[PDB]
């Protein structure tokens, strides 16, 4: 019986905020992934949160990568207005991401709950395969401040006082002229790209401090959205290398390897950097040149994310990071 902490402050101070609580797990072997099917009493969503089955291109590396059109369950592949229509009905969302070497798979489970349930949902249980997990809500004595290493921090609207706060981002795959995210990538990083080698359309949705209204990325006139964009794309490998007990970095960087996405591809659509040892970097991403978000799972591989060259690349699905915000204490 594991535990996941949902951090509730005493008050919310208006705003349609959702709280996020996530925790990682001890691992399981490689080929066990498909067995994982979660049950819950606090998924609460209309068959959309837990029942996330997605067409992936499993890249089994050997030796030598093997692309296979596989189907995965429980991933954090989010959809348009998912958080929103979850909020209006006071229902929840839950997903998990994976960091996998050639042999093992460390999970990371996020749960997203509207703040309208810091009192109703005081405790809960959710089971994922070999692990039960009690979802424990936990009150801090903060009014609305997020608890950051002993102090209650409160954005915004003010000398100025400013700190760095945690933020969780998930990619939402939506198609339309207004979602050409790679165009913003080019306009704000001066990489040598164009619109055909990079066609995936979508955006990111993020929550800050475990209690915040969602932040869409990118939007030009949002201070926090552009902060998140800078953070996400200056470290797409995730701004937290160290998973639960991986400070002594043993990255057997095996090296670059090509793969098809999907398996039926005529040539190699994705470049990767195979590794082994300790799984710390996430293993779920999305292929870039495909208009449809053709999701990719890569065990024992760091997919190519550096967009210095604008072809045969991938973008992360989830991302946990830190960005700068103005606040107050006492």
């Amino acid at each position, epitope marked *: 019986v594991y535990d996941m902490k949902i951090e509730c402050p005493h008050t919310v101070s208006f705003g*349609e905020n959702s709280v996020i609580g996530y925790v990682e797990l001890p691992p399981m072997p490689l080929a066990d992934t498909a067995q994982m099917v979660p049950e819950s009493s606090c998924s609460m969503d209309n068959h959309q949160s837990i029942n996330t089955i997605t067409k992936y291109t499993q890249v089994i590396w050997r030796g030598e990568t093997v692309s296979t059109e596989v189907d995965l369950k429980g991933t954090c592949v989010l*959809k*348009h*207005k*998912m958080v*929103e*229509e979850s909020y209006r009905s006071r229902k929840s969302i839950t997903c998990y991401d994976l960091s996998c070497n050639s042999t093992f798979c460390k999970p990371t489970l996020y749960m997203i709950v509207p703040i309208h349930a810091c009192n109703m949902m005081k405790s809960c249980l959710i089971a994922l395969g070999p692990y039960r997990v009690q979802v424990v809500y936990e009150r801090t004595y903060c009014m609305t401040g997020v608890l950051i290493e002993g102090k209650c921090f409160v954005p915004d609207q003010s000398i100025f006082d400013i700190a760095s706060v945690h933020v969780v981002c998930f990619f939402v*795959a*939506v*198609k*339309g*002229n*207004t979602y*050409k995210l790679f*165009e913003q990538v080019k306009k704000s990083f001066e990489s040598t790209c164009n*619109d055909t080698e990079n066609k995936v359309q979508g955006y990111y949705i993020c929550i800050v401090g475990g209690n915040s*209204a*969602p932040i*869409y990325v990118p*939007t*030009l*006139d949002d201070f926090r959205s552009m902060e998140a964009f800078t953070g996400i794309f200056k470290s797409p490998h995730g701004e937290d290398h160290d998973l639960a007990g991986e400070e002594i970095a043993s990255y057997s960087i095996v090296g670059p390897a090509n793969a098809k996405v999907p398996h039926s591809a005529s040539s190699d659509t994705l470049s990767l950097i195979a590794y082994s040892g300790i799984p710390s970097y996430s293993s779920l991403s999305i292929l870039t040149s495909s*208009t449809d978000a053709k999701h990719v799972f890569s065990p024992g591989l760091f997919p190519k994310l550096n967009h210095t060259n604008c072809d045969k690349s991938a973008i992360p699905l989830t991302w946990t990071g830190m960005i700068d915000l103005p606040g107050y204490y006492e």
Partner: antibody, heavy 124, light 110 residues
């Protein structure tokens, strides 16, 4: 690429019920989360939004035409439909279907993309 | 048409042509404006959303803005192919719907 396409009879006689159907392509209609909308435009005149429906069944009609407008949905077949009852010579217009979106949390804000429209003329 | 647009605006290439859209607190005071360009006898096309944002394939000649209950579309650097009809749209809560402006017939003279 995502495209919307309208279909229906070009002529509908007075005091009938007018039915039109918009079909989505490129995007899965259940991956939408969008406000699927009917808008019209009288000849030489401006624009007027008829109504919208969500992928669940939320019927949000214009107060002027909520008496007459009905909007069908078909999630299993990627379609939605408009049914304007009690049509007269006033309702002759170009009818467009649109994928209205709402950026953040507030309701309908913009329409992207558009179907290329269909001209429904009314005359006995 | 609850949103009030000027009927016609005009200019010559190289201008800064601005198109207006005035409503009340119930429509533009609390919700975003989107801007649409309709070419001669054609289906409309999104130009601005969220009051200033640009779709892909939209030139920053077209910028937008909104203050209080009134919005503007600024074509900074007018060009020949901009001879069309420009509509503004926003959500009105007291009417619980989406409202358009009267359109703006833009003429490129010279």
């Amino acid at each position: 690429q995502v495209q919307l396409l309208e279909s229906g009879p070009g002529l509908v006689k007075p005091s009938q019920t007018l039915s039109l159907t918009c079909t989505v392509s490129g995007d899965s209609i259940s991956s939408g989360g969008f406000y699927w909308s009917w808008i019209r435009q009288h000849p030489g005149k401006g624009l007027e939004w008829i109504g919208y429906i969500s992928y669940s069944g939320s019927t949000y009609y214009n107060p002027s035409l909520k008496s007459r407008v009905t909007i069908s949905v078909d999630t299993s077949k990627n379609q939605f439909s408009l049914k304007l009852s009690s049509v007269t010579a006033a309702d002759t217009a170009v009818y467009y279907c649109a994928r209205g979106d709402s950026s953040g949390y507030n309701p309908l804000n913009w329409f992207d993309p558009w179907g290329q429209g269909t001209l429904v003329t009314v005359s006995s | 048409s609850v949103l009030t647009q000027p009927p016609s605006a005009s200019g010559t290439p190289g201008q800064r042509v601005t198109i207006y859209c005035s409503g009340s607190t119930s429509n533009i005071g609390g919700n975003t404006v989107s801007w649409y360009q309709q070419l001669p006898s054609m289906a409309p096309k999104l130009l601005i959303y969220s009051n200033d944002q640009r779709p892909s394939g939209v030139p920053d000649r077209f910028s937008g803005s909104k203050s209080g209950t009134s919005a503007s579309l600024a074509i900074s650097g007018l060009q020949s192919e901009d001879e069309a009809d420009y509509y503004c749209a926003a959500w009105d809560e007291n009417l619980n719907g989406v409202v358009f402006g009267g359109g703006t017939k833009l003429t490129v003279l010279g």
